[model samples]
Target: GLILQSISNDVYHNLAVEDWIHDHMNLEGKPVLFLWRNSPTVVIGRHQNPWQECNLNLMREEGVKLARRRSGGGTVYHDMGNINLTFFTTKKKYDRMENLKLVVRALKAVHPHLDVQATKRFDLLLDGQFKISGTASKIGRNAAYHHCTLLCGTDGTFLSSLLKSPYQGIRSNATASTPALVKNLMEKDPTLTCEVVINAVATEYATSHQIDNHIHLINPTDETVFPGINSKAIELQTWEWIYGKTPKFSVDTSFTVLHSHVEIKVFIDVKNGRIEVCNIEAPDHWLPLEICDQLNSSLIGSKFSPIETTVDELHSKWNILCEKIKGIM
Candidate 1:
């Protein structure tokens, strides 16, 4: 048998915790489930290029953080109102659609007034029109995990803002698809909330499997449940796992193709399919020399390593001094 647990949504902390569970949880023959939520943020698939799929300017402006999941699928948006669930099992038990079914059934239990169905591709649709949920997965050598987002009372402006960006330099090796129309459950039923959805899922899941609700929640700070797992979580928290892992590639870019034949340089780092670092330099007329140097220097020695601890340092030591040049553009 596998364990069922609920850890309060830790938007930034969950990134490492989820990775720890995926790596340490010995669910080879058994199964496990996780229910979580995150602060306003963008979660890209393991094989996505953040530069292309996300708008960093919007993210920065809106103060939404970005992170990548271990699963393989296109990028998805998240907020406190969204509920994220992950089903873990063995290679032999890998079933994307089956896991998604649990979600459909859970939601139906919550709101029996509506009709919900899973598609041939694992997407869950409501009343045959708007999308209520999205699915994505990652298969390991011996184990597999599938995670999806349940839009409860998510913010549309926040979602749309992060999804649409003007950054053009994006190249990747992993496979990813563009997202479709996203609809939060609150849109259909105003009663829907993260608590409502999670309760519905827990009740339905427990009753369906004849299991107990006494789930033992594990903390990323706890070093006991899964020994050595916390280290893995810390690794995920680093710039390396966040950016350095992107595959090496260059982009052919031009700011103004017609006037003066202005040139632009674009370099992207794609790790496991997500953008790690983006560098742009265009000589012979662009922004300004000080701005260019500051731009490049900003990312230098930045956390592109798996243990992305440098970001905090950047904010404390360097970024603080750059207060003046922050929002000039």
Candidate 2:
């Protein structure tokens, strides 16, 4: 068994560690425990609809990044205050509960008063109601890893605020979050700092796996240590991987213009984060169907993004309408 911790806190580079291990690690007779953290980031599941999972405007304004992981689960927010763990093993050896139970024990080691329990659904809850951890996994044909987030002292307001969707009339079958009251472990005991928690988990993991309690510091961007690893980080950081990987979905909503009290209806079908179908309808008398149709056509086959000054008194109304549509992007 081996335990590794990332030397970088960049979300993309940290996430690349998962990709690297999944592709290159030989888990036939060994297990790896990866401990990592990140700057403020909202990581959505592989099949999740970001527009329906988080507040993009708030995230952008607050300098928080959004990423879509290559795993199936609900969206989760992370920060330096949070800690992540990935238990790597072969398919035959992959066990989610055992790993989760191990985490419970690790938390207890730090503070025996923690009321943490791993649920049948694989989530880790505190006080029977408040969630302290969220789970997800990517199981390949042979190599697989079960990953989870352990909330240490993450900003509670940011977690709740950014996880909320601002768009309305979204219709998709993407996996949504099972909302719960999340609590930071620090609240239970100020003694549970991120450093202490990591040490406890590392020790517990090493003891359970009968390995040396030494955590190897890994640099994902080091090409000598990890050949072709920076490419994985680049891919993970790209717009194509993060946003374009979202599942096909649609948004149907309307916005009202302030001055004329005119209402506009928008309906769009997004596939691979591109506008596959688009329709913008407004009163012909006010906007002229020809102009509305031009806007719709321009949006088709284009990346799902906010339109800024796309066209010139009518332009003002369009700007207001565009502001509302930006929520979907």
Candidate 3:
């Protein structure tokens, strides 16, 4: 087995490494153990809708990055306090249970007094209750990787706050995260910092694979070493990949529009991440049906996003309508 650690804390760049290795790594006879952590990011499943998975506005205001990973699992919050371990192997040799067991063993090795177990759901639970780790994986035709997160000293309050979605009118078949009471390892043992956990896991992995214990630090942005990785990182950070790939879903919700200090009801239906149908009900004296209909029709093909450019033209046309739309979303 080969041990590797990310030299950067940028979520997009680190995630790009996962994609690059999965697409380019030749892990036929040899396996790899990758250890990484992101600064402050929320990574959602491939099939999850970001609008339904997180408080995007809160994340933006707090300067937390968002990334959509190429894995089929629930959304997870990541920070420097968390440790991410990815086990790469051939499709035939892939074993999620084994990797999870290894993680449990490593945790136990670090703090033998701590009680941690891998649950049937692939999560690592502390004292058979609070969750400390979550599992996700990607299996290709010939290669696969099982990755999991270890909460060492993460801010539990922040994690909970950011993972929650502020919007309540979303209707989608997207995968939803299974909320669990989480605890940090340091809560049980103050010495179990991220560094300690990484070292323990690396040692365990090296012993299991009969490999060297040295972890090679890799620069995710080094295109000379990882050709085409820069473009991959760029693609991962694009709005198209981060938001546009969300599964087709609709938002059936309404907001009160204030017109001439009067309240009006505005309803919207969004599909394929765009406005598909819209209706506005207002007093004839406040705003004419023709004007409302025009406003509604104009938004039919617009993006269901908060980006200024997506709604700049509409906002300029009618400030109240734009405000109402933003409120509903």
Candidate 4:
């Protein structure tokens, strides 16, 4: 069945659909539509523990929501000025670069004057310098999906705020790619809105697939095609899926900074490069405990290196953690 069109900025909704598509595979499943929020959120890839990749204190203090996707890739920031697009498909059929081209084609349709291109590595850039979008996806036994965000009217200040937080921790799990500079498409061209870009892509996809451009709306109440999304979405709504999926690992390093007289503690998987977890055990009077915890978790399950996994035995340990983390508690 075709995915009924659903628009939600709520990360939970998109996540549920992603999980659903991954669990159930059929050639006829419909493509869904999701739209929600100008609010800030950080999305990390599969096998990544939030404890390992982001600045938690900043994320918490700013009231930004952090999410872990079923896909594989580095962490990314999303704000109201940006639009995120997810294409769910089977593993045999999933293609990150190819799906990103759909986004590229849509943008080109709207503003041919805008210079945009998809990098060989799956990043979407504007004028070839400033990144306009990022790609990440999850691959499962028989299914896989790719999704990326498009900058439209997102608040740049808010977006920049989250990315500026302190980075800490260690390990050798794969890490997310961070963009150097970014410019919103709407900022680049005041004439564009998310609706315009979406419609263009919808038209293009409908034309190419020989399907009607009339995509249906899907929500928590729309159970016809979604089948079990209500309960499914609920499952994704928990902290377990959001946090517990982190692969297990150990750490062995700490550092001290001269300026604050605060000791920064770091932990690493050492093999996968994914941070097992991060913590800053320092004076509470000088720095907030929450901030220290944030710094600590940012490193949880992240790769130990600037890049790449270090230990050969790390994979086996990671598998064990995945099993335990996903276990019902």
Candidate 5:
């Protein structure tokens, strides 16, 4: 996908091209670079636990797309105000440090007086503290691509809020992301907009490689350009892939009914995005055991999505309990 520009903002479609390039590109020597930005999406690593990494409930209500990238790294928030760069090279040429060094070069070219540097973790931080860029990588058999995010003028408030998971009592071996004091490049310099930094990076990329800076825009949805990529895009949007691949995990959470002051704890195991096992324990005085048993039985084999359950037709105690359970998702 290097030397190419995406013409679409659909998160799944754009990421499909990243997969297309990583799997099919012939980059034995070109060492091409791809630059991109999304409307608003939360991209997580393939091995990450979505429930542990972000707030699925808030993301659903706010209409933000949550994507699981094939690369391995911590999660990141993306928007038009940010710049995503992908460096494609052969396996022998793949080097994260070299690529990060180039980013530091281009960034310094834009802000000569700013104090910015890359860390051992490959993240770019400003003023020796707050982070400005996050990196992730995917190495294939012959080709490899390293991608990173540069915060030019991101929605900092939403970034923090969406990354925080409100649901509690999650225990999993899946990797957890590190929190950083982040700062957008625009905060330090007024002219360092996404457009400005992208242009500077393009210039730096061209100058470093001694190649033409002309970017050929590519449509990720075009089956002609990317054969069999339509299914790839569709797969990216599937629940089976988005949440199913999460490491085997559990949620142990409890909620209280304010009027009665009764509290119930529900523990569940989610696999392949379905509730494989569930248990709800509370005093029987609040609800009869038969109704609670029915609720637990219905929850089995059901997807872990909120509000997509058997709460619609219920009229009484089950309805009230269903509404409370929906909030946990």
Candidate 6:
């Protein structure tokens, strides 16, 4: 097993490393173990709808970054305190349960009294109750990797708040994250820090593979070492890939119109992250049907998000109505 640690904490760059290695690295017989951490970020599955998975407005206000991974799984919250581990091997040797067992063994080696077990869904649970880790994976024709997150001392309050979406009445086939009561290892054992757990896992992987225990530090920004990695990083950061890949979805809901003491129903259909259909129905006495029709037409072809720019053109036409629509989002 080869061990590597990322020097950068940028979520996009680290994810680019995963993509680069998966695409270029030869993993026929030699497996790899990669350890990385990201500055506060939320990473959602490739097939997930961000609107239904997280609170985008809160994330933007809190200065938290968002990323969409190429893997298939529920969304997960990440921070420096959360350790991410990825096991790379050939497709024929891919085994999620085996990778999870290695994690369990490493944790046990660190703190024998720590009650941890791998669940049927591939999650690592603490004391068979609180979840300490969640798993996700991507498999290619020849290469595969199973990655999981380890919560050492992440901010539980922030994690819960950011993952909770304020949007209502979303209807989609995208996979929704399972709300699990999560706990950090530090809460149980003060000595079990992120660094300690990382080293323990590294030691175990080395022992199992009979390889050198030294962890090679990698800088994701170094283009010389990782050719074409900069382009991969840029691709991951683009709005087209981050949000455009979301599955087709719709929102059917209503909002209260305090100005006219009435309610307005809204229906939105989004495809490829763009608003393909939009309809706003308000009482004829509250707002003219033509005005509502104008707003609906303006929303078409716009990104389905709460950002003011999505409806900037019409905001000047009817600032009050725009604000109302933003509030509902």
The best candidate in terms of lDDT: 6
Q: Each model's TM-score?
A: 0.76, 0.95, 0.92, 0.70, 0.95, 0.95
Clashing pairs in 6: none
Q: Candidate 6's residue-wise lDDT over 1-329, tens digit each?
A: 69999999999999999998899899977999999999999999999988898898899989999999999989999999999999999999999999888888899999996789898999999998999999999998668999999999999999999999998988999988899999999999988999999999999999988999989999998989899999999999998899999999888988775654778888989899888999988788767789889889888998776684343543453666677677655
* Runs in model 1 lying further than 4 Å from the true structure: 1-3, 6-8, 169-174, 254-329
Clashing pairs in model 2, backbone N/Cα/C closer than 3 A: none
lDDT score, candidate 6: 0.90
lDDT by residue for model 3 over 111-155, one digit each (tens)?
885789888889999998999999999998768999999999999
lDDT of each: 0.65, 0.87, 0.85, 0.62, 0.85, 0.90
Candidate 1 residue-wise lDDT, 187-248, digit = tens: 88888788888878777667766777545566655667657755765676565565445555
**Candidate 5 per-residue lDDT over residues 76-117, each given as its tens digit:** 999898889888898888888898888888888988867888
Stretches off by above 4 angstroms in model 6 are 308-317
Candidate 3, which ten residues in sequence have the lowest lDDT sum?
308-317
Per-prediction tally of clashes: 14, 0, 0, 56, 0, 0
Model 3 spans > 4 angstroms off = 257-263, 309-317
Worst 10 residues of 1 by lDDT: 320-329
- For model 4, the local distance difference test gives 0.62
- The total number of steric clashes, by the backbone 3 Å criterion, in model 3 comes to 0
Clashing pairs in 5: none
Looking at model 2, how many pairs of residues clash? 0
Q: After superposition, how far is residue 181 of candidate 3 from its true place, in Å?
A: 0.8
